[PDB]
């Protein structure tokens, strides 16, 4: 679980900010899926 | 820059796993476009 996690954190700074943004739409879209 | 990437890695984490899972399969499609 935290390894996972914190990989994914510094692969995800590791993205272009184009790349960044689209990974927090997605999360956006789930937290409005109620 | 940071407080969005950092605000990110905290609402992730409040995701439920299988949705977790589904941001980590989303940063895998980005770096293996190439």
Redesign the interface.
Same mark, same amino acid.
């Given at each position: 679980?935290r390894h =996972?996690?914190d990989a994914? &954190?510094r692969?995800? /700074?590791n =993205?272009e900010?184009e790349? /960044?943004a689209? =990974?927090?739409k997605? =999360?956006d879209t &789930? /937290?409005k899926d109620f």
């Open positions: 679980e =996972l996690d994914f &954190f692969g995800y /700074k =993205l900010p790349a /960044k689209q =990974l927090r997605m =999360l &789930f /937290k």
